[PDB]
Amino acid sequence: FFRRRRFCRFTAEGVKEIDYKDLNTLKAYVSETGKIVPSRITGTKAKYQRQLATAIKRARYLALLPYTDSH
Amino acid sequence: RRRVAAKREVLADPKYGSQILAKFMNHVMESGKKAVAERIVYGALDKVKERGKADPLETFEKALDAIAPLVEVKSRRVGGATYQVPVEVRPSRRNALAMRWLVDFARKRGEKSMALRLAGELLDAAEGKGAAVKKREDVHRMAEANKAFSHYRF
Amino acid sequence: KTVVDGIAHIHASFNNTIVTITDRQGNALSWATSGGSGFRGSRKSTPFAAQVAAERAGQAALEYGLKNLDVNVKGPGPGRESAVRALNACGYKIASITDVTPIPHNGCRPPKKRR
Amino acid sequence: KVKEEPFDVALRRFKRSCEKAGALAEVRSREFYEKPTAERKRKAAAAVKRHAKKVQREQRRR
């Protein structure tokens, strides 16, 4: 039920407009290499999974998160 | 191919008291001529006792283990490429490989007095200069060129 | 000449495997290939031949010392992990093992499909 | 990335960490270009093999 509670990581709270600033949240959703996790592993609702993917791609642009283990 | 094959046993050598020599005697017999082949194996046994003071069973015990090989190839074809695989020779099989190599090189020795042909074969393999020992080690060299195919498409 | 704590580069294609021992500066010390060990064909692509060429690079590396190695593995082909087990067989302290793999995000288009 | 302690442990921590990350099947699909219709066949046949697997397992779940 670990994939069930992470659906409530955004829906149980009123944190609907997520930001690209809380890196302590976003590092839970990024794998060890750098690529972004699926949504059948976290089990988050697909409204927020689309909203989660934008905050990664903006934080990646501002060099707050890497791409690969190369750089 | 249901597995069927049981085991039949031949172990009889009363005039010397041996077991390996009786199985070796069967590889010399042609068309059931047992009494002919019996006096030739003893005929090439006493010439070693004439030659060496040691008991010639142990000369025969040493001459097996310098003709008997360890690994050999096995051409198992993948069905589109002909490969060969060096395989470990089973411990039961490795006795008969030496005894069958030994007789076939005795027949092309090209001497006189037939029991002297087999006499010279058992003398060389206690040293290593026999043609059976040279045929042993050459197939050993074929495995390491084949050693790349040991597990992979094997 | 004396250098220590070198870097081992391993390049593994579908037909050949090239191993190179370098420094932190990225300078050649000893290179060794699967074709130079005398295989040249279907035997060339085997992971056994990636052990023969691996240790042979590990013998001209003791000219300069190099008691510590850092391994970068690169390529899709077989012998990708068999070459690492043939490194400390020569007696080298392997510190860390690292995948380097060129993966284009979109990239140029590859050649066409075989028939 | 795998650091190091015997050596056989760090091998199996590396053979597995590469596969659990990926970048080995993706390399194998870079050697022939698929036209986007043939990439719509993977999208078609794999969706059938997932929705039929949710129902064939229910026969085991009887």
Add this chain to the structure above:
RNA sequence: CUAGAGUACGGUAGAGGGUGGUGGAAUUUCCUGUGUAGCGGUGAAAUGCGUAGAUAUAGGAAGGAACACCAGUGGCGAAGGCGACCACCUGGACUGAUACUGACACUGAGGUGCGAAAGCGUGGGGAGCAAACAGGAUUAGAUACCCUGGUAGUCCACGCCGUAAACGAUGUCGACUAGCCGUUGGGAUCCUUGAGAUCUUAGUGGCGCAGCUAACGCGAUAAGUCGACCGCCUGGGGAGU
């Protein structure tokens, strides 16, 4: 007159368009260091590339196009189509409450538009890929498959052409007809902690009863029961000539 249809008001979701800008990984060409005998390719080889210092490896520069993971029977668009991030203009759909107009609707011969890709015209631009072509191999033979190279093209601006297995092989619109399991988005009611509950519309999937069907099979997203208008079919070749 307000049940069709349309307007005003909140509110969400989206690779729906157009105009600029900016990224990171990878490929190639070039420069420079180290270093020295092969690399590359394949059922196996050969053509090719190499000490006139290649592959490898490190540093740097230039340039071109595509946009991993998220990504899904998932979305949007009238259809073709549409995936990096941001600004910039800009169309329509959903959902709720409430007032207004009071039938203002449907379909549509002719006519008007938007039309994948290959191709055509003038100008740019040239990373990879690659018809035509060249060489090697296979082969009785091999223009072919496989291998090494390689040009128009693919890319951009402007204009043209109008066809495709342009496919759900199913014209648009409206009304009734047992169920069950999914899923996108949106309100509800509800005990409240929910991994909640049930109901209702707008989509999108898997089974299924009546019913229909030559059979296969569809089955509230009908090929079921019925209406309104349009297009089209009449044995095979000859011939969509």
